[PDB]
Amino acid sequence: LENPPPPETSNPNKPKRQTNQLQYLLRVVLKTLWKHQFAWPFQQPVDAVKLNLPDYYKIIKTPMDMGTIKKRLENNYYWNAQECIQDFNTMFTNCYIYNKPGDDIVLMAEALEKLFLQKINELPTEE
Numbered sequence: 001l002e003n004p005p006p007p008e009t010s011n012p013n014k015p016k017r018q019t020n021q022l023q024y025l026l027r028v029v030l031k032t033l034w035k036h037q038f039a040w041p042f043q044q045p046v047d048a049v050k051l052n053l054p055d056y057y058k059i060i061k062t063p064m065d066m067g068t069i070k071k072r073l074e075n076n077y078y079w080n081a082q083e084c085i086q087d088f089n090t091m092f093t094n095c096y097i098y099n100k101p102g103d104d105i106v107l108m109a110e111a112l113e114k115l116f117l118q119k120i121n122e123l124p125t126e127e
């Protein structure tokens with residue numbers, strides 16, 4: 001099985017804006033998670049071909065990863081902060097669907113999710 005193409009990260013047919021919360025999502029939230037020890041498996045799409053995971057995209061139909069999220073932020077793909085937060089939540093939940101509770105990769109995702117929720121509790125004031 002091939003890998004799927006990565007999620008779209010630019011779309012010139014969508015209106016674009018910078019906002020306090022989107023800037024925070026890139027410069028604080030994504031930045032903090034990216035530098036975490038456990039971030040590395042989540043910095044690019046799951047490369048099922050490389051990892052020999054023939055069953056991954058058989059069940060994960062909304063793949064998401066922080067590299068995609070970073071690119072989306074950098075390309076002003078998101079209008080609302082919730083659209084970005086939803087992508088982080090999808091990334092975590094994919095991990096909790098494919099892998100058994102308590103597995104290494106799940107424990108990595110849970111640590112990142114705890115940190116993510118902490119930083120989301122500090123989102124700046126909306127315009």
Ligand SMILES: CCS(=O)(=O)Nc1cc(-c2cn(C)c3c(=O)[nH]ccc23)cc2c1ccn2C(C)(c1ccccn1)c1ccccn1
Binds near residue numbers: 044048104
């Ligand atoms: C940067 C993304 S990548 O695809 O190129 N590299 C890796 C990704 C992933 C990966 C990411 N996600 C979200 C999952 C998941 O949900 N289940 C299983 C594997 C993975 C794991 C990668 C690796 C590399 C080694 N590995 C490991 C060593 C791995 C896992 C499975 C098969 C082969 N190698 C790995 C790393 C951490 C914890 C456990 N295993």
